[PDB]
Design a protein around this nucleic acid. Sequence first.
DNA 1: CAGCTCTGTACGTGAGCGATGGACAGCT
DNA 2: AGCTGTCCATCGCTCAGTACAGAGCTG
Length: 195
Amino acid sequence: FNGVSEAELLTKTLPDILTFNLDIVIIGINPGLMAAYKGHHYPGPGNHFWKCLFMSGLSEVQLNHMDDHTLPGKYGIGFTNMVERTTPGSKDLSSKEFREGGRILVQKLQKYQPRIAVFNGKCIYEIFSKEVFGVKVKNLEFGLQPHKIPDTETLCYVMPSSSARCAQFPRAQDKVHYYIKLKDLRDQLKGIERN
DNA sequence: CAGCTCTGTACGTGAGCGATGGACAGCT
DNA sequence: AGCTGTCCATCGCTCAGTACAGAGCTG
């Protein structure tokens, strides 16, 4: 990574971009090597997050990782991760790391209380649900989850990971449907507040 | 048995590497 | 005309969670 060792990137962390009164908080799994390197969220040239944000209309123009600090103020979107530690892949993390992460995540969500907690990846919500709601469904599905963050009105919404790793949603286009439904849910919630 | 949990395998696109080699121009 | 080096187009290749079978567990 421009002469920067993998060993150096593994020690690096990615700061959260969180504020109060947010519509959405994107919760990633943990920082990848490129995110740790850049110090920005979803810089993966193949990661579908920014493409999907635009293709869905959640951003009116095409943005990139360098824009992530403007997302709270201009788009009502923030970022955090289930696990802070940088790894080359999601499977390099332990069960205890994820459950430590879940506990830390629920406290951050109870503080900032965004309208919607968006789990960027089914695997992290599977862990979160089990730990926080004590729920393990056989048929865990994407989309809105039937449980609010404890002691809040924050909804849980799950999407296929923006990572281009999963073959089941091979392209940004195959994930865009979930980002459109996320936008619609945000619009419904703001409309409920209005009336 | 029947429903779980746990573990290992298999899977589609597209961005961007290093390697390769074709096009081309400068120079003799 | 022949030589040679740069540039760049192009190629092969790598690589950034999810689903599900089946072994194991247990009521």
